[PDB]
Scaffold this active site. Sequence first.
Site, PDB file in Angstrom:
ATOM      1  N   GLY B 232       0.801  -1.212   0.000  1.00 51.02           N
ATOM      2  CA  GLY B 232       0.000   0.000   0.000  1.00 51.02           C
ATOM      3  C   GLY B 232       0.838   1.268   0.000  1.00 51.02           C
ATOM      4  N   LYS B 394      -9.089   1.595  21.804  1.00 52.11           N
ATOM      5  CA  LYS B 394      -8.160   2.574  21.261  1.00 52.11           C
ATOM      6  C   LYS B 394      -8.551   3.970  21.716  1.00 52.11           C
ATOM      7  CE  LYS B 394      -6.595   4.789  16.974  1.00 52.11           C
ATOM      8  NZ  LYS B 394      -6.470   4.660  15.501  1.00 52.11           N
ATOM      9  N   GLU B 769      -2.200  36.893   6.433  1.00 48.94           N
ATOM     10  CA  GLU B 769      -2.332  38.343   6.342  1.00 48.94           C
ATOM     11  C   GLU B 769      -0.981  39.060   6.404  1.00 48.94           C
ATOM     12  OE1 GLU B 769      -3.861  41.607   9.287  1.00 48.94           O
ATOM     13  OE2 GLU B 769      -4.884  39.735   9.851  1.00 48.94           O
ATOM     14  N   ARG B 847      -6.813  43.839  21.172  1.00 48.34           N
ATOM     15  CA  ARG B 847      -8.149  43.291  20.982  1.00 48.34           C
ATOM     16  C   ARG B 847      -8.491  42.407  22.185  1.00 48.34           C
ATOM     17  NH1 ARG B 847     -12.130  42.802  17.472  1.00 48.34           N
ATOM     18  NH2 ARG B 847     -11.047  44.224  16.032  1.00 48.34           N
ATOM     19  N   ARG B 879      -8.110  34.046  13.140  1.00 52.59           N
ATOM     20  CA  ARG B 879      -9.533  34.291  13.370  1.00 52.59           C
ATOM     21  C   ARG B 879      -9.832  34.506  14.856  1.00 52.59           C
ATOM     22  NH1 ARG B 879     -13.687  30.274  10.157  1.00 52.59           N
ATOM     23  NH2 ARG B 879     -15.422  31.742   9.836  1.00 52.59           N
ATOM     24  N   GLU B1228     -15.247  36.525  12.225  1.00 45.94           N
ATOM     25  CA  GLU B1228     -14.672  36.085  13.498  1.00 45.94           C
ATOM     26  C   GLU B1228     -15.573  35.918  14.725  1.00 45.94           C
ATOM     27  OE1 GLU B1228     -12.047  39.426  12.934  1.00 45.94           O
ATOM     28  OE2 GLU B1228     -10.348  38.138  13.493  1.00 45.94           O
TER      29      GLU B1228
HETATM   30  C1  LIG Z   1      -3.033   8.979   7.281  1.00 48.45           C
HETATM   31  C2  LIG Z   1      -2.571   7.663   7.738  1.00 48.45           C
HETATM   32  C3  LIG Z   1      -3.300   7.081   8.872  1.00 48.45           C
HETATM   33  C4  LIG Z   1      -2.877   5.818   9.444  1.00 48.45           C
HETATM   34  N1  LIG Z   1      -3.579   5.286  10.580  1.00 48.45           N
HETATM   35  C5  LIG Z   1      -3.193   4.126  11.241  1.00 48.45           C
HETATM   36  C6  LIG Z   1      -3.935   3.542  12.424  1.00 48.45           C
HETATM   37  O1  LIG Z   1      -4.914   4.031  12.862  1.00 48.45           O
HETATM   38  N2  LIG Z   1      -3.413   2.327  13.045  1.00 48.45           N
HETATM   39  C7  LIG Z   1      -2.178   1.656  12.551  1.00 48.45           C
HETATM   40  O2  LIG Z   1      -1.816   0.635  13.070  1.00 48.45           O
HETATM   41  N3  LIG Z   1      -1.557   2.144  11.442  1.00 48.45           N
HETATM   42  C8  LIG Z   1      -1.962   3.307  10.772  1.00 48.45           C
HETATM   43  N4  LIG Z   1      -1.250   3.786   9.594  1.00 48.45           N
HETATM   44  C9  LIG Z   1      -0.082   2.986   9.099  1.00 48.45           C
HETATM   45  C10 LIG Z   1      -0.742   1.822   8.224  1.00 48.45           C
HETATM   46  O3  LIG Z   1      -1.450   2.477   7.104  1.00 48.45           O
HETATM   47  C11 LIG Z   1       0.323   0.924   7.703  1.00 48.45           C
HETATM   48  O4  LIG Z   1       0.688   0.156   8.980  1.00 48.45           O
HETATM   49  C12 LIG Z   1      -0.318  -0.109   6.761  1.00 48.45           C
HETATM   50  O5  LIG Z   1      -1.044  -1.123   7.444  1.00 48.45           O
HETATM   51  C13 LIG Z   1       0.811  -0.619   6.154  1.00 48.45           C
HETATM   52  O6  LIG Z   1       0.433  -1.461   5.021  1.00 48.45           O
HETATM   53  P1  LIG Z   1       0.955  -0.991   3.686  1.00 48.45           P
HETATM   54  O7  LIG Z   1       0.497  -2.074   2.668  1.00 48.45           O
HETATM   55  O8  LIG Z   1       0.729   0.405   3.257  1.00 48.45           O
HETATM   56  O9  LIG Z   1       2.426  -1.085   3.849  1.00 48.45           O
HETATM   57  P2  LIG Z   1       3.789  -0.560   3.121  1.00 48.45           P
HETATM   58  O10 LIG Z   1       4.099   0.941   3.279  1.00 48.45           O
HETATM   59  O11 LIG Z   1       3.988  -1.089   1.854  1.00 48.45           O
HETATM   60  O12 LIG Z   1       4.802  -0.821   4.151  1.00 48.45           O
HETATM   61  C14 LIG Z   1       5.039  -1.970   4.661  1.00 48.45           C
HETATM   62  C15 LIG Z   1       6.322  -2.211   5.444  1.00 48.45           C
HETATM   63  O13 LIG Z   1       6.045  -3.713   5.697  1.00 48.45           O
HETATM   64  C16 LIG Z   1       6.919  -4.531   4.781  1.00 48.45           C
HETATM   65  N5  LIG Z   1       6.032  -5.525   4.207  1.00 48.45           N
HETATM   66  C17 LIG Z   1       4.809  -5.359   3.526  1.00 48.45           C
HETATM   67  N6  LIG Z   1       4.238  -6.407   3.153  1.00 48.45           N
HETATM   68  C18 LIG Z   1       5.002  -7.380   3.545  1.00 48.45           C
HETATM   69  C19 LIG Z   1       4.907  -8.981   3.430  1.00 48.45           C
HETATM   70  N7  LIG Z   1       4.013  -9.629   2.904  1.00 48.45           N
HETATM   71  N8  LIG Z   1       5.999  -9.720   4.006  1.00 48.45           N
HETATM   72  C20 LIG Z   1       7.149  -9.111   4.676  1.00 48.45           C
HETATM   73  N9  LIG Z   1       7.315  -7.682   4.819  1.00 48.45           N
HETATM   74  C21 LIG Z   1       6.229  -6.837   4.252  1.00 48.45           C
HETATM   75  C22 LIG Z   1       7.597  -3.588   3.844  1.00 48.45           C
HETATM   76  O14 LIG Z   1       8.820  -4.046   3.393  1.00 48.45           O
HETATM   77  C23 LIG Z   1       7.713  -2.303   4.722  1.00 48.45           C
HETATM   78  O15 LIG Z   1       8.759  -2.353   5.683  1.00 48.45           O
HETATM   79  C24 LIG Z   1      -1.631   5.076   8.835  1.00 48.45           C
HETATM   80  C25 LIG Z   1      -0.918   5.676   7.641  1.00 48.45           C
HETATM   81  C26 LIG Z   1      -1.344   6.912   7.093  1.00 48.45           C
HETATM   82  C27 LIG Z   1      -0.510   7.392   5.934  1.00 48.45           C
HETATM   83  N1  LIG Z   2     -13.897  29.819   4.347  1.00 49.55           N
HETATM   84  C1  LIG Z   2     -13.135  30.694   4.996  1.00 49.55           C
HETATM   85  N2  LIG Z   2     -13.791  31.575   5.893  1.00 49.55           N
HETATM   86  C2  LIG Z   2     -13.202  32.580   6.653  1.00 49.55           C
HETATM   87  C3  LIG Z   2     -11.555  32.734   6.491  1.00 49.55           C
HETATM   88  C4  LIG Z   2     -10.941  31.768   5.547  1.00 49.55           C
HETATM   89  O1  LIG Z   2      -9.652  31.889   5.422  1.00 49.55           O
HETATM   90  N3  LIG Z   2     -11.745  30.808   4.845  1.00 49.55           N
HETATM   91  N4  LIG Z   2     -10.875  33.837   7.285  1.00 49.55           N
HETATM   92  C5  LIG Z   2     -11.595  34.299   8.586  1.00 49.55           C
HETATM   93  C6  LIG Z   2     -10.943  35.477   9.180  1.00 49.55           C
HETATM   94  S1  LIG Z   2      -9.698  35.186  10.132  1.00 49.55           S
HETATM   95  C7  LIG Z   2     -11.493  36.826   8.816  1.00 49.55           C
HETATM   96  S2  LIG Z   2     -10.724  38.178   9.531  1.00 49.55           S
HETATM   97  C8  LIG Z   2     -12.741  37.019   7.823  1.00 49.55           C
HETATM   98  C9  LIG Z   2     -12.333  37.615   6.599  1.00 49.55           C
HETATM   99  O2  LIG Z   2     -13.260  38.210   5.662  1.00 49.55           O
HETATM  100  P1  LIG Z   2     -14.324  39.123   5.802  1.00 49.55           P
HETATM  101  O3  LIG Z   2     -13.691  40.382   6.423  1.00 49.55           O
HETATM  102  O4  LIG Z   2     -14.998  39.484   4.725  1.00 49.55           O
HETATM  103  O5  LIG Z   2     -15.355  38.572   6.637  1.00 49.55           O
HETATM  104  O6  LIG Z   2     -13.305  35.737   7.302  1.00 49.55           O
HETATM  105  C10 LIG Z   2     -13.247  34.557   8.227  1.00 49.55           C
HETATM  106  N5  LIG Z   2     -13.882  33.458   7.502  1.00 49.55           N
HETATM  107  O1  LIG Z   3      -8.192  44.998  15.243  1.00 49.74           O
HETATM  108  C1  LIG Z   3      -7.976  44.121  14.422  1.00 49.74           C
HETATM  109  O2  LIG Z   3      -8.813  43.224  14.405  1.00 49.74           O
HETATM  110  C2  LIG Z   3      -6.844  44.132  13.552  1.00 49.74           C
HETATM  111  C3  LIG Z   3      -6.645  43.074  12.611  1.00 49.74           C
HETATM  112  C4  LIG Z   3      -5.513  43.046  11.724  1.00 49.74           C
HETATM  113  C5  LIG Z   3      -4.571  44.105  11.788  1.00 49.74           C
HETATM  114  C6  LIG Z   3      -4.719  45.167  12.692  1.00 49.74           C
HETATM  115  C7  LIG Z   3      -5.857  45.162  13.559  1.00 49.74           C
HETATM  116  O3  LIG Z   3      -5.932  46.220  14.407  1.00 49.74           O
HETATM  117  O1  MOS Z   4      -7.720  36.877  12.028  1.00 48.16           O
HETATM  118 MO1  MOS Z   4      -8.722  37.391  10.312  1.00 48.16          MO
HETATM  119  O2  MOS Z   4      -8.655  39.332  11.445  1.00 48.16           O
HETATM  120  S1  MOS Z   4      -7.370  37.767   9.148  1.00 48.16           S
END
Ligand SMILES: Cc1cc2nc3c(=O)[nH]c(=O)nc-3n(C[C@@H](O)[C@@H](O)[C@H](O)COP(=O)(O)OP(=O)(O)OC[C@H]3O[C@@H](n4cnc5c(N)ncnc54)[C@H](O)[C@@H]3O)c2cc1C
Ligand SMILES: Nc1nc2c(c(=O)[nH]1)N[C@H]1C(S)=C(S)[C@@H](COP(=O)(O)O)O[C@H]1N2
Ligand SMILES: O=C(O)c1ccccc1O
Ligand code: MOS
Lengths: 99, 1299, 50, 50
Positions: B232, B394, B769, B847, B879, B1228
């Site tokens: 994967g 978990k 900003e 502020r 914000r 805000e």
């Molecule tokens: C956003 C994100 C969220 C995630 N959340 C979790 C979570 O909640 N819980 C958790 O446990 N993990 C989590 N993971 C890690 C998990 O996705 C990996 O553990 C996944 O299970 C690995 O499988 P894979 O096929 O991608 O492995 P690969 O990246 O391909 O990696 C596998 C590793 O195992 C080895 N390997 C693979 N297959 C074999 C085989 N058949 N025999 C011998 N060696 C092998 C490879 O050589 C390498 O060292 C997350 C990853 C991301 C990017």
């Molecule tokens: N979707 C979205 N909404 C948002 C933001 C953003 O970056 N994305 N910035 C916030 C902040 S920090 C400010 S100061 C105001 C900015 O615009 P406005 O003065 O017109 O309301 O929008 C708020 N709403």
């Molecule tokens: O008062 C604010 O909210 C403010 C925001 C951005 C820059 C200067 C400022 O005084």
């Molecule tokens: O934090 Mo929004 O005043 S840019």
Amino acid sequence: EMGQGLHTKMVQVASKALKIPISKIYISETSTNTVPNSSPTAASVSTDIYGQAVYEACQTILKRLEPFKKKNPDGSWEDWVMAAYQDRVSLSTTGFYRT
Amino acid sequence: ADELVFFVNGKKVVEKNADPETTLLAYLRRKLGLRGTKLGCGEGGCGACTVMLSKYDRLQDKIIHFSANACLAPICTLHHVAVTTVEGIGSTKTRLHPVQERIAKSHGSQCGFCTPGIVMSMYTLLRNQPEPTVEEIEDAFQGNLCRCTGYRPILQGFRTFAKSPSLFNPEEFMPLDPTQEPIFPPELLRLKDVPPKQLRFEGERVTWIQASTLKELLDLKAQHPEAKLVVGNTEIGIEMKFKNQLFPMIICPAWIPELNAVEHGPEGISFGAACALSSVEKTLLEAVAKLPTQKTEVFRGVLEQLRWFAGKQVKSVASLGGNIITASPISDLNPVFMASGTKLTIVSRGTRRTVPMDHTFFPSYRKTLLGPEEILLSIEIPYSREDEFFSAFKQASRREDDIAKVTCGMRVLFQPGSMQVKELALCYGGMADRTISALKTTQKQLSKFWNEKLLQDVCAGLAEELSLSPDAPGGMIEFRRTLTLSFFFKFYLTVLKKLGKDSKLDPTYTSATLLFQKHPPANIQLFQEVPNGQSKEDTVGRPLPHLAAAMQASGEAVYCDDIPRYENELFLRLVTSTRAHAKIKSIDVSEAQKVPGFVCFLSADDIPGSNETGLFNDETVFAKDTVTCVGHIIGAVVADTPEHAERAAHVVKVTYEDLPAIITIEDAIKNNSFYGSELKIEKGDLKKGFSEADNVVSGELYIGGQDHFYLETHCTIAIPKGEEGEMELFVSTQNAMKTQSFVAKMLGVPVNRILVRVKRMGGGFGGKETRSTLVSVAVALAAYKTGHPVRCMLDRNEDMLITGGRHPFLARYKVGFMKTGTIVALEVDHYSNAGNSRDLSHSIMERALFHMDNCYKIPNIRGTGRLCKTNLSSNTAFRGFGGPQALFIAENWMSEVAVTCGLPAEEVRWKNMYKEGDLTHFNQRLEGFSVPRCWDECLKSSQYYARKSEVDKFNKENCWKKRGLCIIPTKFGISFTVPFLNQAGALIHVYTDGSVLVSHGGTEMGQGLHTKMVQVASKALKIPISKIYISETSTNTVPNSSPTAASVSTDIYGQAVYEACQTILKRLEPFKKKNPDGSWEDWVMAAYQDRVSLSTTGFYRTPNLGYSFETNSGNAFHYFTYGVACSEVEIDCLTGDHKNLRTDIVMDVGSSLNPAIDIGQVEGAFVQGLGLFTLEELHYSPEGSLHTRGPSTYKIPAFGSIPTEFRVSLLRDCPNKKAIYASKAVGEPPLFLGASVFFAIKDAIRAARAQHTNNNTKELFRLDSPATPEKIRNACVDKFTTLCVTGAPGNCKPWSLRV
Amino acid sequence: HFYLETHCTIAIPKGEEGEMELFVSTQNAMKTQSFVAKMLGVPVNRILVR
Amino acid sequence: CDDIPRYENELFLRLVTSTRAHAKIKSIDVSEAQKVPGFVCFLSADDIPG
Ligand SMILES: Cc1cc2nc3c(=O)[nH]c(=O)nc-3n(C[C@@H](O)[C@@H](O)[C@H](O)COP(=O)(O)OP(=O)(O)OC[C@H]3O[C@@H](n4cnc5c(N)ncnc54)[C@H](O)[C@@H]3O)c2cc1C
Ligand SMILES: Nc1nc2c(c(=O)[nH]1)N[C@H]1C(S)=C(S)[C@@H](COP(=O)(O)O)O[C@H]1N2
Ligand SMILES: O=C(O)c1ccccc1O
Ligand code: MOS
Ligand code: MOS
Ligand code: FES
Ligand code: FES
Ligand SMILES: [Ca+2]
């Protein structure tokens, strides 16, 4: 600009109207989102009419800077512009001309 | 071999030179030019890169469809696979697919960066189940994150696939017709009848071998034991990208049938080691549904874990073998396989052995008892036996897609029909550098009976056997130890219940044995219908969806990095400091220069202009002489590709000489390390106030920081024009003006030479900003030096490390009040951790001070603020801009006032609340104070009083679970507290066809500003919105713009746009008069022919602003936005997890310009606050090095994090004359309302403490933010937390006592 | 005419709402804009001529 | 104009023009053009959306 030196002339004009060096003025290009519904650059009148439009936009700027200039006569163009900015006075304006 | 052949959206792709390191995401974006799929983290945790994969399955003799993260999928695993991206199911140029149409029309898309990925997750679901249930729909998004919406609309809109005015109408949605779906590539169907053959791919550094048979796999491993297997790639992909791992030879055995075989035997179910976790889940669910409960105990345990194992994208590609062999300390499956002695069939060329997984299988960190020539062939999960029970638990930070803090597998075998232990296995993860078994503890219970004495003996044993040193990696020592005992307790009770046959436990102890249960969603949105006489073309006040929603749902919306690169475009990679504070002694680029594609290394010496930058000329563009934080930008590498730039930068060697570092707020205080002097607002007479006060409470409170986590990270493209120093930049920033001047300052050229254009941001929230210039200036320098266009988009880890976040706050407070609850005096000293530069820290503290009162009148009050200068990345706008921190502190002492007085919280808050006309502590009049109405309305619609009963009842009937309820108000001052920023310009052109192009100083970051601006223009000119258009934001159309912030954009740009339209109307007036019956087009053309200009600017300056801290007078804000929220929660006193049962919000946004957008802003802000106060936490080493650098460790709110019953109402009939069309800023203000969940949690904890802790009803225990599961669990003191007391174990009583 | 630089146009499709940005060697940005818009069948505000 | 760098995915257009002063267009064959390396497409009146 097609080589006739229109931008050079408009900078020369803006510089005189504003009373600042040309070095502080710049023209990058011509675009439909900065100046709309423009007639084609033709009839040899571009300097005549754009020079006038640039002149008018410059007068507007000068009118907006007046209070600050009057407050700090010995100040620099830069001091007046910033003061105008700090006082939340718009530093942007269109200019127009109709023969 | 040699040739890789696959399909993308039905089109054949033939890659003759596939490089093993190329991911699908990169290939899609760079090679194919399909930018719909986005890079959000490259870590598998955000889903922005989600796509669908289809292939022929030789077994089911059917075409299967599943989702996957393009960022982790090697293209070399995709031979003969059909890929489908967002642009392959529909588009606005052709026709949107129902999934795209619905998410867009339901207001499920804001900034839109996450939309394509969520669209594909939903699409994949429908492709598998055309009529999914509500539960299947939510589970479809376990691996997708959204930072803007609050998730509610996305789910609600997609709910239509299942089976007062409204925000959208489901009756207009086009029905889903599966017969019109793209057909599986015919050519791929033919190739199914051709036996696979081993393939070989050669990259720049890696060789990939796709083995077709088991024999090939074994021969290769016998010949090349070093060869790294890959299935994967969800682990290896992370190791290569984040752990600097390089495997020159990879073997993918995924095609091997032996590794995909599933067999139902007498002892259990066997799965090939390559089977995807989703396949295991499917088979096991079936087995559990068909077989007797007593035989599926273990399968159930596996299913419980799979339930909280990553998301759909990862589970559909991650294999069993991969998880087992990765041997991660926090594997959620190994503890289960170990506790059940799951059988492992291991083979090698000529050898073959099968063994039950036991404690010995994992000798040490990341290792297993596999020989270098061996591979795991298959795994057999055991059938459950009679008298044998099993559990699996978990606990992480977030319920969905999170890493386990502590995870376990528990099994017990009794003598026939007895309660006498024959076998007992308690295996845990997250308690050591490998999966371990508490053998000492369990061995002592053999032959013992299942009773109270055994429970106590086991708990004591675990506390001793599963010890943790103070320097244990991951910290949270007390919490983790407490979980190991709590899990056993849960196991203990569950077994009692099971032994009790049932087919009896104290009723108050039953919920402790229950597994997490989803609750049916119930969302309601209330807003005001527009006046009946209003014109159809007048959209102000109508629920008009975001103008770019459809294009965002179709992946056509262009974000900075989606812009095509030039033929000669280069890539930049920042080189940053790895020390918090040190002198830079030497920089060696020797090795970097050897990296292919290296173009150059840039540093301070290359800057043509000034190296002084920052909002306060507080910073360097490139550090010189010294670094003052980890992540401090030292220089940058420019290369021909992103990869090469990254590689070159990594090997740039910097030699340092550490200098004393100041990291924490406590550090700064001790060292008197601050920026500027004390900030202060004081009113009344404090001495007198505390004197008249009946009671007085003192304390200290802390609020952790927060990462913006905008789905689209920082990004800039800089195009040098080669003339007069001119440069054009495309930047993801809320502040084009500062970007322009900072680039100009660094280059040493006039500001008029720099053009900055912002089309949109995939989120900003304040993080863009000012801090966006850190990247913009560096990229601008690169373009200046090379004369080539250059670009840079930060990876998630770089973003979180470098760009800054919300300011952590520490507060010391003291409040005087009467026995009635009335507050008479308050003193609060605030301290914020500002980082290595000033930035916006000062205004943020201001502020904060302006909101230390929240909604309460306090006669005598004094608040101070100090900015702590520290060796951390500079913190900035987020914000709320300081308001949430100050509002949180206020509500905290307010909650202690209620507790101390022994009175209902809502009662104490109401009598202290301001009333119409009162003045704040900073002496501003509160005119049109609508909190009272929001408050009474929320109390009523939420049924507050009635539910207060339901909660107390629940707490009496439940011993290990409790509920909490709390209603909170808020007020947020509107306007920039810096007077001069309250200005806005606009520019409007009307072309001769009558179409209008509007441009204003504000930027679009997903909040719907352009949409609102078009609505305002359409109403003002009285023409349809369809004739108006907003393309982008740019410094050459509207100059000197204030950053898009402070929630006032709609207010001020709305006014500038309005004025521009008036001027337009004035000029067209003479023609409208001449030709009254004419059309807009006729008038425009007539004006043009008469030579009347159809172009004008518009400007607005907010009136009457100017607060002075010296005289404590002057208006700080133009008006205030108000709101009230009531939330109810349920916590698990044994694990720390909690459910957000229900939340009701009543917000006053005056007369909304768009109730869909507002409400979307309310829900979005509420959820980010929810994250700030209960889920998001950043961790740093003692040296100031950020640990939390990605979605895997930084948990923002997920789809399943929002309140199950989420109701939002916009206050009716409350026009605000202080703003455009009587509306109110909404950006805000609603964020702090997320605290309603924090205090409801605190309420629940109070109930749990009364249950097993003290007896002191008026006890005031400290609860800092965020109220994470760690903090929630540790606060629920009981016999378990006592046996885990950090340090001071049963072995440490002092020799003597008596002060 | 024999302008040393012959006629030339670069058209950049933005992929959104018919938007297109064009870099052209012309004395008439307005007509280039409207003629391009007429041919495409989109409002003139969607076309940018530089 | 043509000095502006080309995008990595930028294409090139070549006008197809009349060789007759006045005539009816009876047929248009692009079968040979389609065989030229790098050929992308031939555009004609029917391709105009507006
Ligand atoms: C956003 C994100 C969220 C995630 N959340 C979790 C979570 O909640 N819980 C958790 O446990 N993990 C989590 N993971 C890690 C998990 O996705 C990996 O553990 C996944 O299970 C690995 O499988 P894979 O096929 O991608 O492995 P690969 O990246 O391909 O990696 C596998 C590793 O195992 C080895 N390997 C693979 N297959 C074999 C085989 N058949 N025999 C011998 N060696 C092998 C490879 O050589 C390498 O060292 C997350 C990853 C991301 C990017
Ligand atoms: N979707 C979205 N909404 C948002 C933001 C953003 O970056 N994305 N910035 C916030 C902040 S920090 C400010 S100061 C105001 C900015 O615009 P406005 O003065 O017109 O309301 O929008 C708020 N709403
Ligand atoms: O008062 C604010 O909210 C403010 C925001 C951005 C820059 C200067 C400022 O005084
Ligand atoms: O934090 Mo929004 O005043 S840019
Ligand atoms: O022939 Mo010139 O008027 S353009
Ligand atoms: S970019 Fe693939 S999961 Fe985030
Ligand atoms: S709309 Fe989902 S992250 Fe912005
Ligand atoms: Ca700062």
